[PDB]
Symmetry: none
């Protein structure tokens, strides 16, 4: 089956970004012209996923609801669930067990921003994979900060380690994952790691050992914009601004993607444009159709 | 009397910045490494004002309270009051009548960012003025968007117009004002303009006609950053970021300002820095003391 | 035949960028960590093109030769020729007539900077096209400034205009072109335009009217960094720096491309690294092998 | 005597910046909208110095002369001299001995960028000093990279060390110095240091030991931009671009300075702005007068 459910994990207290995140959720922070979460949301929409569960903190979930509603305005079906404590990426599947049901599901971090050509085809295999899991590898300068995947000479991925002190490679596993239905029980069966979290890397290693993990390489022609510091956030906004102003197009605009993939029509677009017409956003949509 | 009370007017629905202000008050949005509200707050602190009333919309006032508390952590006394409808800048003095009492009071807009090494000195005269008012002029190339002050050959302020279609000068009257106690009665007597607002420019014209208006000039050593569009927000964040890292200092950091003006001591700075120490905002403070 | 010759047109006086370009040729200006010309040179190398003619002004041509030499150090064959006066892009084929001989040839502008995922594949049809020409269309905000290609409902390119006052579309024809051997005679018979230049757009319209022009779409996932203003130059440098620092990889590094495509071996790279080892460039190459 | 002569030391091979300095003199590289040399040149002009000697390498000197000419277009008198080998900053006084004659003279490095609203007043004292020397200190986080000046409790300069492994303070002695006529003979008596150069710090230590040294402090309102690496160059260009755009001015624009200090008149400004009018550098000047 094609993966048609997705979860955006957008919780966390954001201590690493204080004081900016003392009174605004990290995933609501603007990346130039739109909140951060519009980017990973766009990534799921580009993969054809329209049924999505958003997980956030007790305090932030209602702000995401206020921003997005049930998503029907974009031809989506959005649901929300609260994560009491940030216990690890894998907890997303426990919290989302009912939402997932017996289907396949993708997980994307609310702060995962991708930009690049052919992202839909980069994700196509993952979306259509019969069983197992797919993750994406990206070369970074500081592998120690991420889940790291090692490849042998044939170029086959043969190991995964979470924040290794001596990375076996410079390839980090990104915040976009595709899983089959077995991930739910797999997650419920995990024990906390040394840092007290249900590790996504433990989930991935299981799939790998059973030969069910596909590691899709995301080439250097793609940008995976970091959002870990005040500096990286402003560099992400400038990057997106440089692209949009030059092209006269927006990057990860849900309304545009919904329209282009026919989740909604021109008429619906014109309505959505109304409340946004005081700036380039609403005008952009009207000009579009 | 030295002006020792101040009001930060930080209401508004933020429609102009949608969708980034759909779930977030514009004044909580970050300008590089701190919430926008830290900027006008620092401006008042730099004038020696420690008793401050923050006004916002019903919905947003509690978020400002959660972010700032009563201000005692920085040696300030912050109180809060709500503005049900944005009836105009001058309504700040009606809502703040009880807070003001019989004292002089300054008003700063919550979305105004003032920068300038000599600003404290420039505000000194305004703080000490015995009666009347002081406003701050800044050269812009789009005067038609603001209150505009015209000067005669001698250099005396001769007229004030709110968004003149044919500006008489290129000097905008910025959102920082120091008034004597009579502004409250002036405000309570104003009638709404054509746009249905109690205008700050009408208040300023009254002081001008009584011969009690001083105009402080902010020359090219100053910056008054635009926060009106997605584009101006990133331009403002870029400005703060480049100046802080190239000049090795922090712009409008209340903890630093409170410490430097002795509102708080080194022990308190370290205590405040703890929760903020995962990034340079907190580490800078620890190094400072 | 596969296109195996290329021309980099890097002349012009650069008046648009004065006074920066009174002091340095535009194509020698740094785009973060390397001279601008390294970018279009990398593009040709990525297409497998190693036999290249560099055209510049009488004053600058020796500068490029000083920088690049004959390119043998990177397994290329670089030659130089002077363009007495900037009489138009098409003059490149007259100046390069002897160099081109009877072969196919690509033309890239010395200030053309592309960044994106599958560039080699995007150019593959062009490199292998039997006869005719191939150009690349990119969506921009200001088509008026470029050669514009209009598409009909079916998506077929139906017209080409050079800087139309009323663009028939928002697709600009970039500075990368692939031609068969017939372009030389077209160029020799072209009459100057209203502005007194031999227009590349007239050459392209000739191919188009013969039904021999392919228009390869460069999606919004690619960046075509503008280099026309002081502002666009720093946005380009920041864009590249953002990508490189995050990845720990360089964009358009000729030594790396030469090495990866086996134009040179590791031993060769070590020698090239020597004179560059005082900064990350030299160190990067050493680390690479 | 008022200091009326200045020397800009602009040699060196700039190997740390390869490959961008392979075919371009480092001081001809742009810092946003004008060549690097314009900055230290403006620093001298702001001190009222109009008789200037530019010293560079045998390959680069002619390029500066090509760009700047005799400086008469800006009411200056510029002359040039070649430094055969980079034997040290202090060699400037030997090479420039004939130029200096019996007068006082300032020395500024060709790659130092000084910014600050009060710099002119700050330099006024130095220009008027009857005898002795004035140097400029600036706080840095990496004092070990520069000449370092230590102050006692009183605030008196008590030691000077060139690149100390154990810095005695964090105040760097920047690349701007004002000397009386005794500096020439001091230079003739210097012996090369361990690194084989005539050190400016030995000269300054002599003045210090004779109790004839003044140290001007550049505090928070100043910026002293690093131009040593590819990264610092873009950081410096970002600083200039942001300050210029946000504050509506030009940093170190010789035409503007020449006009404002009455070195040239409005007609000459327009004439000079013509060739520069395709962009804002020229348009700003036209608007200025
Ligand atoms: O104790 C925790 C841990 C994470 N989070 C949140 O979950 C998201 C994950 O971010 P982060 O903690 O910085 O990622 P890491 O936990 O360091 O790494 C995970 O996410 C990386 C990027 O997606 C993967 O490379 C790693 O393999 C995976 O373990 C964020 O928005 C966090 O706020 C919390 O709230 N609390
Ligand atoms: O009743 C009100 C009116 C305004 N605001 C806020 O105040 C700021 C002011 O913005 P805006 O209303 O759009 O500015 P204008 O009212 O058009 O202009 C005012 O602010 C300018 C400087 O920013 C001055 O030059 C003008 O003279 C003055 O009238 C915003 O964040 C508003 O939301 C409130 O909170 N309540
Ligand atoms: O005789 C010439 C003409 C141009 N150039 C250089 O080529 C580049 C092109 O810039 P410019 O001359 O300003 O562009 P245009 O010639 O106005 O336009 C051309 O380049 C555009 C994309 O850059 C295309 O869209 C247009 O169709 C094509 O005609 C610059 O670095 C020029 O200096 C030369 O070296 N020699
Ligand atoms: O004989 C020489 C020596 C240097 N330079 C140039 O002068 C600048 C100085 O650069 P560099 O030699 O690398 O700096 P240092 O000599 O290490 O440091 C000097 O410059 C610093 C400020 O930039 C001061 O703090 C130090 O005290 C002073 O010794 C460069 O553009 C050089 O190419 C010359 O043109 N000729």
């Amino acid at each position: 089956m094609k993966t048609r459910k997705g979860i955006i994990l957008a919780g966390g207290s954001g201590t690493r970004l204080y004081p900016v995140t003392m009174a605004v959720s990290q995933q609501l922070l603007p990346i130039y012209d739109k909140p951060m979460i519009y980017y990973p949301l766009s990534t799921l929409m580009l993969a054809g996923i329209r049924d999505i569960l958003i997980i956030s903190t007790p305090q932030d979930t209602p702000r995401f609801q206020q921003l997005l509603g049930d998503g029907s305005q974009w031809g989506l079906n959005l649901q929300y669930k609260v994560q009491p404590s940030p216990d690890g990426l894998a907890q997303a599947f426990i919290i989302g067990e009912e939402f997932i049901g017996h289907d396949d599901c993708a997980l994307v971090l609310g702060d995962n921003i991708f930009y690049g050509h052919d992202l839909p085809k980069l994700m196509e295999a993952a979306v259509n994979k019969e069983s197992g899991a797919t993750v994406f590898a990206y070369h970074v300068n500081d592998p120690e900060r991420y889940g790291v995947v090692e490849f042998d000479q044939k170029g086959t991925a043969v190991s995964l380690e979470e924040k290794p002190l001596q990375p076996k490679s410079n390839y980090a596993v990104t915040g976009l994952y595709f899983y089959d239905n077995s991930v739910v029980e797999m997650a419920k069966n995990l024990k906390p790691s040394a840092r007290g979290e249900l590790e996504i890397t433990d989930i991935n290693r299981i799939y790998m050992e059973q030969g069910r993990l596909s590691v899709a390489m995301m080439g250097r022609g793609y940008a995976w914009l970091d959002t870990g510091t005040h500096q990286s956030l402003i560099e992400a906004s400038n990057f997106i601004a440089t692209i949009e102003e030059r092209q006269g197009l927006k990057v990860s605009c849900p309304e545009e993607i919904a329209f282009r993939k026919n989740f909604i029509n021109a008429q619906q677009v014109i309505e959505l444009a109304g409340p946004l017409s005081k700036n380039d956003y609403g005008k952009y949509l009207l000009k579009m159709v």
